[PDB]
Design a protein around this nucleic acid. Sequence first.
RNA 1: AUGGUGAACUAUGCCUGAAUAGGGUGAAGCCAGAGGAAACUCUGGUGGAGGCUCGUAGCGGUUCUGACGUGCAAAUCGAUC
RNA 2: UUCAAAUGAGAACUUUGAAGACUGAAGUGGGGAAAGGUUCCACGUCAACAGCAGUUGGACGUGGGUUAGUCGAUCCUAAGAGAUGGGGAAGCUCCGUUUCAAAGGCCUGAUUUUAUGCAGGCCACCAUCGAAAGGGAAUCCGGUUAAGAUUCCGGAACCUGGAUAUGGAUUCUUCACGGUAACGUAACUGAAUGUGGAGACGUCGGCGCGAGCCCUGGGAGGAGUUAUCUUUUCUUCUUAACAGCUUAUCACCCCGGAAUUGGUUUAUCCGGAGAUGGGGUCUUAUGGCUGGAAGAGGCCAGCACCUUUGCUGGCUCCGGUGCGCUUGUGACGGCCCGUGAAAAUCCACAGGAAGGAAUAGUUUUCAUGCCAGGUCGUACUGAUAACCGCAGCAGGUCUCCAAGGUGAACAGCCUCUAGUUGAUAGAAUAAUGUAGAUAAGGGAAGUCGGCAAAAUAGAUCCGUAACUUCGGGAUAAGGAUUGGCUCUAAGGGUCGGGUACGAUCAACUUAGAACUGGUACGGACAAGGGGAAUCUGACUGUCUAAUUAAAACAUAGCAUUGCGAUGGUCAGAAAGUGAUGUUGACGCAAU
Lengths: 60, 252, 50, 77, 91, 63, 112
Amino acid sequence: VFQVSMKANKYQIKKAVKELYEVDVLKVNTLVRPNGTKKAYVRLTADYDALDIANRIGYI
Amino acid sequence: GRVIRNQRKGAGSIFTSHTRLRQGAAKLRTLDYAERHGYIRGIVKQIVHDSGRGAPLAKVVFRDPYKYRLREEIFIANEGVHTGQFIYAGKKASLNVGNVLPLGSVPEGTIVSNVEEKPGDRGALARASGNYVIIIGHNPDENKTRVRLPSGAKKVISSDARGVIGVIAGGGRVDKPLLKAGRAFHKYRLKRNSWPKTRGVAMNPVDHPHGGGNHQHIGKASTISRGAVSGQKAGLIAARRTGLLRGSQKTQ
Amino acid sequence: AAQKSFRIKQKMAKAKKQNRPLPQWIRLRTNNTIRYNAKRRNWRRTKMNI
Amino acid sequence: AREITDIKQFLELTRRADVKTATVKINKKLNKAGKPFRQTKFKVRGSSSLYTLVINDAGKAKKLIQSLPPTLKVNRL
Amino acid sequence: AKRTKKVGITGKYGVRYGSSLRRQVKKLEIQQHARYDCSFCGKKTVKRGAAGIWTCSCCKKTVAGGAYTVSTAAAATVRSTIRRLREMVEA
Amino acid sequence: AHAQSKREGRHSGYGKRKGTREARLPSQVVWIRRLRVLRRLLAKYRDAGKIDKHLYHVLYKES
Amino acid sequence: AQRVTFRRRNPYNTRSNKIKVVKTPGGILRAQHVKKLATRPKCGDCGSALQGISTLRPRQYATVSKTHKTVSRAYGGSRCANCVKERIIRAFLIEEQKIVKKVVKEQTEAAK
RNA sequence: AUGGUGAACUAUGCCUGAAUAGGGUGAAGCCAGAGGAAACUCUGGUGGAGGCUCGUAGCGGUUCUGACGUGCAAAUCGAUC
RNA sequence: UUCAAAUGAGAACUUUGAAGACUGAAGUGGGGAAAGGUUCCACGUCAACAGCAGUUGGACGUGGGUUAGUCGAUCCUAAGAGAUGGGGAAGCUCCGUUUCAAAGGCCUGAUUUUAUGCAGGCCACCAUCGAAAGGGAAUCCGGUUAAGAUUCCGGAACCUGGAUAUGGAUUCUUCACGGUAACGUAACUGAAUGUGGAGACGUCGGCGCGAGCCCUGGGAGGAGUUAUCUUUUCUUCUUAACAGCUUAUCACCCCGGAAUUGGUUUAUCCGGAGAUGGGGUCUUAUGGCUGGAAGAGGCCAGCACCUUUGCUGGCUCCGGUGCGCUUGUGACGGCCCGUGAAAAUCCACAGGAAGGAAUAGUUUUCAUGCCAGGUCGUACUGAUAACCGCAGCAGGUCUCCAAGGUGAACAGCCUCUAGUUGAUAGAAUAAUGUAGAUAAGGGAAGUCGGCAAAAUAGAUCCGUAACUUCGGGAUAAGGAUUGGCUCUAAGGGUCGGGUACGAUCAACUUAGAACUGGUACGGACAAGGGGAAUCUGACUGUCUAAUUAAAACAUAGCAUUGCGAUGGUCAGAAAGUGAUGUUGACGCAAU
Ligand SMILES: [Mg+2]
Ligand SMILES: [Mg+2]
Ligand SMILES: [Mg+2]
Ligand SMILES: [Mg+2]
Ligand SMILES: [Mg+2]
Ligand SMILES: [Mg+2]
Ligand SMILES: [Mg+2]
Ligand SMILES: [Mg+2]
Ligand SMILES: [Mg+2]
Ligand SMILES: [Mg+2]
Ligand SMILES: [Mg+2]
Ligand SMILES: [Mg+2]
Ligand SMILES: [Mg+2]
Ligand SMILES: [Mg+2]
Ligand SMILES: [Mg+2]
Ligand SMILES: [Mg+2]
Ligand SMILES: [Mg+2]
Ligand SMILES: [Mg+2]
Ligand SMILES: [Mg+2]
Ligand SMILES: [Mg+2]
Ligand SMILES: [Mg+2]
Ligand SMILES: [Mg+2]
Ligand SMILES: [Mg+2]
Ligand SMILES: [Mg+2]
Ligand SMILES: [Mg+2]
Ligand SMILES: [Mg+2]
Ligand SMILES: [Mg+2]
Ligand SMILES: [Mg+2]
Ligand SMILES: [Mg+2]
Ligand SMILES: [Mg+2]
Ligand SMILES: [Mg+2]
Ligand SMILES: [Mg+2]
Ligand SMILES: [Mg+2]
Ligand SMILES: [Mg+2]
Ligand SMILES: [Mg+2]
Ligand SMILES: [Mg+2]
Ligand SMILES: [Mg+2]
Ligand SMILES: [Mg+2]
Ligand SMILES: [Mg+2]
Ligand SMILES: [Mg+2]
Ligand SMILES: [Mg+2]
Ligand SMILES: [Mg+2]
Ligand SMILES: [Mg+2]
Ligand SMILES: [Mg+2]
Ligand SMILES: [Mg+2]
Ligand SMILES: [Mg+2]
Ligand SMILES: [Mg+2]
Ligand SMILES: [Mg+2]
Ligand SMILES: [Mg+2]
Ligand SMILES: [Mg+2]
Ligand SMILES: [Mg+2]
Ligand SMILES: [Mg+2]
Ligand SMILES: [Mg+2]
Ligand SMILES: [Mg+2]
Ligand SMILES: [Mg+2]
Ligand SMILES: [Mg+2]
Ligand SMILES: [Mg+2]
Ligand SMILES: [Mg+2]
Ligand SMILES: [Mg+2]
Ligand SMILES: [Mg+2]
Ligand SMILES: [Mg+2]
Ligand SMILES: [Mg+2]
Ligand SMILES: [Mg+2]
Ligand SMILES: [Mg+2]
Ligand SMILES: [Mg+2]
Ligand SMILES: [Mg+2]
Ligand SMILES: [Mg+2]
Ligand SMILES: [Mg+2]
Ligand SMILES: [Mg+2]
Ligand SMILES: [Mg+2]
Ligand SMILES: [Mg+2]
Ligand SMILES: [Mg+2]
Ligand SMILES: [Mg+2]
Ligand SMILES: [Mg+2]
Ligand SMILES: [Mg+2]
Ligand SMILES: [Mg+2]
Ligand SMILES: [Mg+2]
Ligand SMILES: [Mg+2]
Ligand SMILES: [Mg+2]
Ligand SMILES: [Mg+2]
Ligand SMILES: [Mg+2]
Ligand SMILES: [Mg+2]
Ligand SMILES: [Mg+2]
Ligand SMILES: [Mg+2]
Ligand SMILES: [Mg+2]
Ligand SMILES: [Mg+2]
Ligand SMILES: [Mg+2]
Ligand SMILES: [Mg+2]
Ligand SMILES: [Mg+2]
Ligand SMILES: [Mg+2]
Ligand SMILES: [Mg+2]
Ligand SMILES: [Mg+2]
Ligand SMILES: [Mg+2]
Ligand SMILES: [Mg+2]
Ligand SMILES: [Mg+2]
Ligand SMILES: [Mg+2]
Ligand SMILES: [Mg+2]
Ligand SMILES: [Mg+2]
Ligand SMILES: [Mg+2]
Ligand SMILES: [Mg+2]
Ligand SMILES: [Mg+2]
Ligand SMILES: [Mg+2]
Ligand SMILES: [Mg+2]
Ligand SMILES: [Zn+2]
């Protein structure tokens, strides 16, 4: 789950995820948070384990 | 004072014609080469009800003499014409009900409808259900054709003016009592907001020349002159006479 | 109004953000005079006119 | 979303390039008014349709199971 | 059994609008709902709808007529006086 | 239990009747039934040959 | 005794908001919106529902094979095969009488 | 007086939608039957017309000159209509 | 409304359990539209607010929450709105919208300098905005959250656009065969141009069918009652989109040639322009079987245990009935001086430009396979507390779903599911009130006046005046009857009869007869007072929102007037301006 630029569409998220995190994205669902911010629900293909890629970027 | 009712109509806000369902504009064909040198054939593909109109319309399709295509016109249905009939339109054309012929090319006594005032205006006179004009003579030099219009007036127009042989379907429509308000309601519902009519004598004087008074009365002569000004003209405008017309009518 | 234009949703977001008490550390600043948040809004009391 | 009965066409589906996974379903039903029998359903998952072959004959079932291509993933039950 | 002594179809209006108005309507109303002989196909299947318009049940022909009757006496004579004039332009 | 008594022609006197006899069961429903029953007999009586079409055709219009 | 609700924002009973009630595998009732019914195509000549032709909504005729949109005789998905019988006889007879019309008025020109 | 802002109420036309328990009455059309010398007159059905009708919801707002009259309410509440 | 427990400094008011009730599917239920904007959810929490209280809250503090190729927007056009060449106007600006305008863009050929110049031929269509109820490409079921779901998860589809290749089909008779025909199909080339159709359309009526509901039998389970009675009462027994085969009223074809006229609808319409009959063709609304799919969901049992919470099982079956109810739909019929949108978009046909095989071509409207589908909305309330009424106001504010009995019924009255039990509380019961009732004898004497109140009332049967436009008046008036229980009679369906009847299944209607009671029985609920006249408006209809609903306005009918377009009436400062006018005297305008 990423907070994403309002200017960014579903394509620009899928691409910016692969480039910044070296992962395959299955599909991207977005919604506008009720404070004027974009939330991306980014789902990875079965090869990549999200939990691992999540404490590889650091948060936990 | 106020602006009286007949003055508000010219602005046309709530008084414009109720037009959505109309079939189109009834018109003779454009007075092209074929019609003014020979004649052209068409088929009435349908005769149909035009909303708000007395008389049925006749959809009559022709060939386009200049492009490979069908071009359809909207005629007023002359009584007796039918689906599948062949309509001929032209200077040299048979004198049969439904065909359109220049007034010069029909004998006297011919009975035609939808006739042109000047040639080519695609139909001016004798259009309401049941009406027609009769040709009452010819003047071959200047090729005028004297006709008599439904009012009784006897206008003289060009012999090139076009009319359609016969009378207009749907006659007698005005012999049946409307019998009740609703019939008149649905009548004017598909024409225009002219109904119902409050009498100027039932309003206060702001509203109408006839308004006010402790009894309901006109108060002065209801014959208003032609030279009267807007807001004055209500009643019997420019009446040359008045009262129950007794004795035979029928212009001499 | 259960199906919004984004213009309205955006303004709605800004109003939410503005709806918070005075951040209490500001009260401790030198020469501070703001006692409370004097522009607090509430849906049941004042409608924000779109 | 499609039913099949041509046992020849079936094996042709099971070796169609896009077909990677299949599944066999075992049901206990009855025979015409009386005793029970063992119905098997061979379901072949194509790239846009799920073909399923109903083999009511228990004997025809076993012979057809080994007939399956060896390189086909076949979820049992 | 005879149901009404004179009103006939006009009985739907009951007592309203005055005997004479009802009488005039009953005439044209009887005129307008009736089945007429078809010129083209020789059956009595012409009926109205939309005053002016008269179409035949089978044979699907539609004739322009009078508002509450197929042929109106005016258009009738006009037919003949055109028939007369036409013949003046061949013989 | 009450439905059973009703089936036994009970609770149906003039003092248990609030809707009109026509509202309770329309005349037309009665007719359409009877005239369809009569119309059905003439067909089978003819199709079996018990009655020739010339008597059938008359009985139809009298039905 | 179980009641139901629309499944789309539109709350009114418009012709584009027809509903069907349906019993699902969950053992409960649930609405399912129904597209407006399709009507049959029509003979341009006569006007009857011309037979042979499948009856869909117009955009759906693009998701169906050509055999569903025609019949094998001339003027297939267009005219009602008794009108075709008629525009054949009419054609043939008029072309025949047209020949008759010429040599008759050719002899007229040779004797008049 | 001058320049401006309003048809979110309401009045009227237009466009596009939507809504209205259950009863009474029994108009044309139609089928069969009876009388009569004739002209013609009758009867029983069928059918289901109407700015018809009893009456809810709806729309209205007649009377109590009822409640209230520093109100629930700057027009409401009850009964009746 | 009540009892008790829990919680808490504190409990009429919070939480839980128990009891009493309510809303009674025209809801106090389950959702939405407009409007609100976080009220949604969790946690904490009571200074102010919730006109008593408060530990509770739509409050306060802190956080969390709204996931889409298929639902909406987006596209289209409706009344309308409004740029543009222009025409007015000192000017802000007014007018015109295809309008006196040199108004614009697609298919592919030409290229092998090479990218797009020109060689054809079309089209003269001439902005654009305007529907979260009109038109419209395409999704379902199960599971899942504290709070999201036709959006997540799972499984199963479908549409559109872009690529494409293998298989099938087709061709040496190049562009498929079969059927007499209706027409059939897995396919079965088709440019310009033209044409047809679908989008695409009122209303009411009865009749036919579908679905969901309602009622009900047998069985297989679980629950309640059991002093006594009840093989009983309650409850579970489900099957989505999509796919294959099949399924139709109507329509149509072939054989045939009809008076002794026949077929036939509830409703009289059809036949020598070919009926009755026999045989065929078509639409697939809709239903059936199967795939989806029992692996789901539903109901039970049998063991496991602080846990994540499992595990093993079984059953999920077969039917009945219809003037039932809601809705859908069909073939008809009634009505009109009313005849009941538009455009986008999609298909078909007519046409035959062209291109195309024997040593191998044409084929992507047949099958299968590849990729992709953005942007914004998505929480919740929708009201006696989330909207508007200064407010948590007895007001106002568009709509879908809709069980059982009584009964004509969506009435009233009681119930099931669901939701409530919210409205300061305690003690008394004076006067006077407000709202609900009853009164001996009289019976309008009361009063401006029968104001108020009372009386009446359903249904079946009997009976019914003047007068009348013959339609009415009329429920005129006036009468009788009405429970319970036990019987009788009449009214139907379905199947074999050589080319009279039998057998069996299922429905409340109506009439008649006995018995019976403190003479009661439309037992609550529901439900017209009637008559004789005068004045007045014909009638249905309309108005003074917030003191006037009427005799006032309207209306049909009657009558008068103006006008043939270079026109009548009307608008504007002006105009290459506008209404009537998509008009034409059976018209428009004015009385
Ligand atoms: Mg989204
Ligand atoms: Mg003035
Ligand atoms: Mg206009
Ligand atoms: Mg008006
Ligand atoms: Mg008037
Ligand atoms: Mg007048
Ligand atoms: Mg006045
Ligand atoms: Mg004056
Ligand atoms: Mg004067
Ligand atoms: Mg006066
Ligand atoms: Mg007067
Ligand atoms: Mg305010
Ligand atoms: Mg402001
Ligand atoms: Mg009847
Ligand atoms: Mg029968
Ligand atoms: Mg007969
Ligand atoms: Mg919803
Ligand atoms: Mg076909
Ligand atoms: Mg087909
Ligand atoms: Mg408004
Ligand atoms: Mg409607
Ligand atoms: Mg009644
Ligand atoms: Mg009624
Ligand atoms: Mg006799
Ligand atoms: Mg009726
Ligand atoms: Mg009425
Ligand atoms: Mg009434
Ligand atoms: Mg009632
Ligand atoms: Mg009213
Ligand atoms: Mg009311
Ligand atoms: Mg009141
Ligand atoms: Mg008062
Ligand atoms: Mg007081
Ligand atoms: Mg009332
Ligand atoms: Mg309390
Ligand atoms: Mg409690
Ligand atoms: Mg209750
Ligand atoms: Mg109710
Ligand atoms: Mg909600
Ligand atoms: Mg809390
Ligand atoms: Mg406190
Ligand atoms: Mg508050
Ligand atoms: Mg308080
Ligand atoms: Mg307090
Ligand atoms: Mg908060
Ligand atoms: Mg918060
Ligand atoms: Mg959609
Ligand atoms: Mg878009
Ligand atoms: Mg402009
Ligand atoms: Mg638009
Ligand atoms: Mg839309
Ligand atoms: Mg729409
Ligand atoms: Mg779900
Ligand atoms: Mg969640
Ligand atoms: Mg929810
Ligand atoms: Mg999914
Ligand atoms: Mg899948
Ligand atoms: Mg594709
Ligand atoms: Mg073939
Ligand atoms: Mg087209
Ligand atoms: Mg069309
Ligand atoms: Mg429409
Ligand atoms: Mg679907
Ligand atoms: Mg047959
Ligand atoms: Mg055959
Ligand atoms: Mg078939
Ligand atoms: Mg029936
Ligand atoms: Mg409805
Ligand atoms: Mg029609
Ligand atoms: Mg089509
Ligand atoms: Mg394809
Ligand atoms: Mg794009
Ligand atoms: Mg929601
Ligand atoms: Mg609430
Ligand atoms: Mg408010
Ligand atoms: Mg309120
Ligand atoms: Mg039940
Ligand atoms: Mg609630
Ligand atoms: Mg209170
Ligand atoms: Mg109280
Ligand atoms: Mg008290
Ligand atoms: Mg007292
Ligand atoms: Mg007493
Ligand atoms: Mg007394
Ligand atoms: Mg007395
Ligand atoms: Mg007295
Ligand atoms: Mg007195
Ligand atoms: Mg007095
Ligand atoms: Mg009295
Ligand atoms: Mg009174
Ligand atoms: Mg009493
Ligand atoms: Mg009387
Ligand atoms: Mg008795
Ligand atoms: Mg019996
Ligand atoms: Mg029997
Ligand atoms: Mg009285
Ligand atoms: Mg009156
Ligand atoms: Mg008033
Ligand atoms: Mg005033
Ligand atoms: Mg009144
Ligand atoms: Mg009043
Ligand atoms: Mg008079
Ligand atoms: Mg000028
Ligand atoms: Zn005919």
